[PDB]
Amino acid sequence: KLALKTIDWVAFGEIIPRNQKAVANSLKSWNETLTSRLATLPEKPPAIDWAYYKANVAKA
Amino acid sequence: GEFADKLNEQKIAQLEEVKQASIKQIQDAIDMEKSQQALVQKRHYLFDVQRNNIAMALEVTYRER
């Protein structure tokens, strides 16, 4: 489980100089990207039906 | 007779600039305070976004591995 300092975005909007809005944008999207990502990428992968493979092999 | 009118209109004019200044200055005590309040909380978020980003990126990485 992760800690994730909570964040109000309209404030974040209101603290970036204009000559730095670029950065801030990319920073936002990465976050969103990253977030979407974790929503879909499961903690662990599926297990592996070892019995089954053991059941159908040939090398010992 | 005029003695009064010029002086009076003078005297009003004054307190008219006085009330004016007074509004304008207290509006500025006000702005300053907003400026502050902002720099307070406000600014950390930038770095928080950044730290959060890292945390996630390592998690994704761990998971991907």
Curated annotation (Swiss-Prot), chain A:
Summary of the function given for this chain in its UniProt record: Subunit d, of the mitochondrial membrane ATP synthase complex (F(1)F(0) ATP synthase or Complex V) that produces ATP from ADP in the presence of a proton gradient across the membrane which is generated by electron transport complexes of the respiratory chain. ATP synthase complex consist of a soluble F(1) head domain - the catalytic core - and a membrane F(1) domain - the membrane proton channel. These two domains are linked by a central stalk rotating inside the F(1) region and a stationary peripheral stalk.
Taxon lineage: Eukaryota, Metazoa, Chordata, Craniata, Vertebrata
Name of this chain's protein: ATP synthase peripheral stalk subunit d, mitochondrial
Localization per Swiss-Prot or TrEMBL: Mitochondrion; Mitochondrion inner membrane
UniProt family annotation: Belongs to the ATPase d subunit family.
N6-acetyllysine PTM sites in chain numbering: K28, K44, K59
Assembly and binders: Component of the ATP synthase complex composed at least of ATP5F1A/subunit alpha, ATP5F1B/subunit beta, ATP5MC1/subunit c (homooctomer), MT-ATP6/subunit a, MT-ATP8/subunit 8, ATP5ME/subunit e, ATP5MF/subunit f, ATP5MG/subunit g, ATP5MK/subunit k, ATP5MJ/subunit j, ATP5F1C/subunit gamma, ATP5F1D/subunit delta, ATP5F1E/subunit epsilon, ATP5PF/subunit F6, ATP5PB/subunit b, ATP5PD/subunit d, ATP5PO/subunit OSCP.
Domain of life: Eukaryota
Curated annotation (Swiss-Prot), chain B:
Modified residues (N6-succinyllysine): K11
Chain positions with N6-acetyllysine modification: K19, K34, K42
Location within or outside the cell: Mitochondrion; Mitochondrion inner membrane
Signal sequence coordinates: none
Family affiliation: Belongs to the eukaryotic ATPase B chain family.
Subunit: Component of the ATP synthase complex composed at least of ATP5F1A/subunit alpha, ATP5F1B/subunit beta, ATP5MC1/subunit c (homooctomer), MT-ATP6/subunit a, MT-ATP8/subunit 8, ATP5ME/subunit e, ATP5MF/subunit f, ATP5MG/subunit g, ATP5MK/subunit k, ATP5MJ/subunit j, ATP5F1C/subunit gamma, ATP5F1D/subunit delta, ATP5F1E/subunit epsilon, ATP5PF/subunit F6, ATP5PB/subunit b, ATP5PD/subunit d, ATP5PO/subunit OSCP.
Function summary: Subunit b, of the mitochondrial membrane ATP synthase complex (F(1)F(0) ATP synthase or Complex V) that produces ATP from ADP in the presence of a proton gradient across the membrane which is generated by electron transport complexes of the respiratory chain. ATP synthase complex consist of a soluble F(1) head domain - the catalytic core - and a membrane F(1) domain - the membrane proton channel. These two domains are linked by a central stalk rotating inside the F(1) region and a stationary peripheral stalk.
Name of this chain's protein: ATP synthase peripheral stalk subunit b, mitochondrial
Gene: ATP5PB
Residues represented out of the complete protein: 121 to 185 of 256
